[PDB]
């Protein structure tokens, strides 16, 4: 039997193939990073790059969903070991929000690659994920300004992962 | 600051962490069989395949979730890319419920170590994964079952594909 | 068509059939035991022992269950009358008691068998079966401790069949 | 102490034991069926024979019931293992369908004999059975009659399964 | 008149005695630890260690009917005077932490033993017990580990106090 | 730092302490007398007994309490091992009613040292303490009584056990 072509365009199609391997990749080091502070005794940012590992992936899910939607092949590359060995809190976050900031990067390079071919339809699935992506960027930045204005002094690293066990919980619900 | 030791022994560690990159792989196997059906006009194993494997996801962090609360690293490794290369419907289920097996024997290896240790807390956790592990190779041997007894004469691939659509529907 | 092999071993097939039958067997004999009640003036001892007679099936059934989702051919044995001769209240529950204890002996043996050969699938289900067992094990335990409290002397018989009927009706 | 003797008379007392271990014949006979098609890919059978073959347990219950209630013995006796090796799904309800018409003559026979002995309180009891045998008998002529109008040919099978899962369901 | 014998095994009646009287003796030192704290400015800790005793005699209670229900004659012996003097907030978690992986361990024992001589009633049995007193080592593991990150120099333990206190609250409802 | 002294008179801190030492002695007699009814058929005797333990304990727990809230540091002694050793139903009870009147004189000593020091901050503390006792004393003598009624001839202990067994259900 014969099924249809895909519906997207070959450089759309690879883009957003590549985009699904970055937020596994993503999910993949928040765990490690979240890992990391468990076992450092900051289960407050622990649960908070936990949930946040967990979001990517579900990121991923709805990116494939499109893609499944579209009939377009879904090519999972292998997925690299995530760092493991971190100096700090201030350290991780710091590697959290760059890491933010490129993804935000190859979404934006995405949406516009859609606006050239014209894929207008792609363009607005990706809507949602501009907006929740950039939310994310935002908030890392936040936590990051956060930690660095506590400081690590004393019992500093203590309220630090106190503040960022509110955020984690809030979020929840 | 001091943070207290791993609460597990080392070999159970080792066993928790293979585990946990054994599922992330078969979540990426299932998205990859998944993507098969929809791109072959079969979305309803389409469906089916892609909630197995974000389940396959679920269990990959709560056994995070565990090693975490025993102040265990975790330890990821680099997860290869899974096959994509599928000859049919029969195919992808026979190869599926090969891999469900090999799972619950992998499984049934920890928690034998883990009565050779006498680690009845990691026991008493992996019962709930033991049982949903289970009722998983069970679901393939039976959706496996009917595609075999459906076969693939005029429009039985739409009949199986059809079938396993109620399933993914039905537990959901 | 082809259908998939049997998902146990051997040996905890043949465990778990010989199960099933046992379970078959309790419901003869219970039945019978119930019946020499209600022709003697006993009806509380009588409604006790088919409620659990009934129960007993439902074990069987549930391990059926189990056997039928694993693939694997339930396999029932030729039936042989239960003893229907007995001498009083007291030594059919003497014969009960002994008769769970040996029920509970072969449970234990099947669950045993599982840890040896790693079959913790079936250890899991059997679970709910190790505990229902027990508390029905207790049950007969208590109901034979009281019969003897009460004795045989002077509407004893009765007080203890009263006794009997309330657990019985409790119970539903 | 003095226990009444039996209410019933003793032709009457032979046929209802006699139509208990019938019932108890039942049971198993449709639990190996069942467990055939479960064996076998048809699980939409297997579903409907088992819960048919726990419905005839109920039956032997109720006559039980009755027997105890009359002061009447129970008298279970031996019964060969059930048939265990079936050539097909027709095969099978062919069977089936020839031994609910045995079971149907078996109770119209005891109702005939309870009008030839004046035992009206025996004819009443037996009605509730008479109604339920015979719809049951029914439903087999109809599984077996659109056994036939599917065929066995490509996915015919598979269609007639789940047609009889759908009645297995609806039946609750 | 004659009353049924023990449905349990010798060995697994007397380990199963002796757990019941552990359990009463952590009760009686968590009291003790308790004590210590409330007369030194820490009722946080003082409250959470008082209801942690009373859960630990909700165990040896369980236990007892376990053993009640099975005809099996409850052996309860002297009960040892808890230790009462103490260096500090950091020293009683350290003890506490200590006492709890002991428990810990001597249920693994009744367990493996039950494993040993088939009793699977037992085995059963028992795993509410295992999964409550994991959670309970987890717990001392993670207050321990915060004590230690927040330390005790100017208002460290005041805030260590409080994180106690709010631990304590969230578990009684 | 420096954290404030105890609120209480050194003599009141004796008396309490004391006091709580003897209610977790208490405790392990009713515990010690409760495992003894059980294993001897008086399941009901068994309950009451224990629940009856479970609720001296209670009292030790809000003695505790006041201690604490008044910064007097609890001082737990060595709890001697309970009897073990009994004749029967009829003695356990004399023997517990004599233990109920005893604790009953400690806490009106403890009460009577209170007035003597005008600490009346622990006089109205222990009120709730008096009232539950004496509740307590005369529950145990209105059993003894009712024991000692019923007395000890053909299934007397029966009737007894079921009286205390309705006591402890409508207690809890
Ligand atoms: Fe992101
Ligand atoms: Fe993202
Ligand atoms: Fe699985
Ligand atoms: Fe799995
Ligand atoms: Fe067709
Ligand atoms: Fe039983
Ligand atoms: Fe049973
Ligand atoms: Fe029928
Ligand atoms: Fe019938
Ligand atoms: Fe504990
Ligand atoms: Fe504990
Ligand atoms: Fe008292
Ligand atoms: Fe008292
Ligand atoms: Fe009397």
Redesign the interface.
């Known amino acids: ?1 014969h ?1 249809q072509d ?1 519906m997207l365009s070959k450089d759309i199609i690879k883009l957003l193939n590549e985009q699904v391997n970055k937020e ?1 990749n993503s999910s ?1 080091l928040y ?2 990073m ?3 502070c ?6 407050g940012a ?1 649960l908070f790059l ?1 949930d946040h590992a ?1 979001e990517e ?1 579900e990121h991923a ?1 709805k990116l ?2 499109f ?3 579209n ?12 760092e ?1 060995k971190f100096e700090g809190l201030t350290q991780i976050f710091q590697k959290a929000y760059e890491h933010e900031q490129h993804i935000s990067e190859s979404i934006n390079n995405i949406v516009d690659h859609a606006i050239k071919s014209k894929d207008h339809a792609t363009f607005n699935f990706l809507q949602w994920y501009v907006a929740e992506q950039h939310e994310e960027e935002v908030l890392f930045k936040d936590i990051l300004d956060k930690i660095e204005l506590i400081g690590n002094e ?2 500093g ?2 309220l630090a ?1 106190q503040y960022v066990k509110g955020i984690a919980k809030s979020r929840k619900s």
Chains 1, 5 share one sequence.
């Open positions: 039997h099924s895909p596994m993949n765990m490690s979240s890992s990391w468990y076992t450092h005794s900051l289960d622990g936990f967990a992936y899910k494939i969903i893609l499944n939607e009939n377009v092949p879904v090519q999972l590359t292998s997925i690299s070991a995530p493991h004393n019992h690293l203590y992962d």
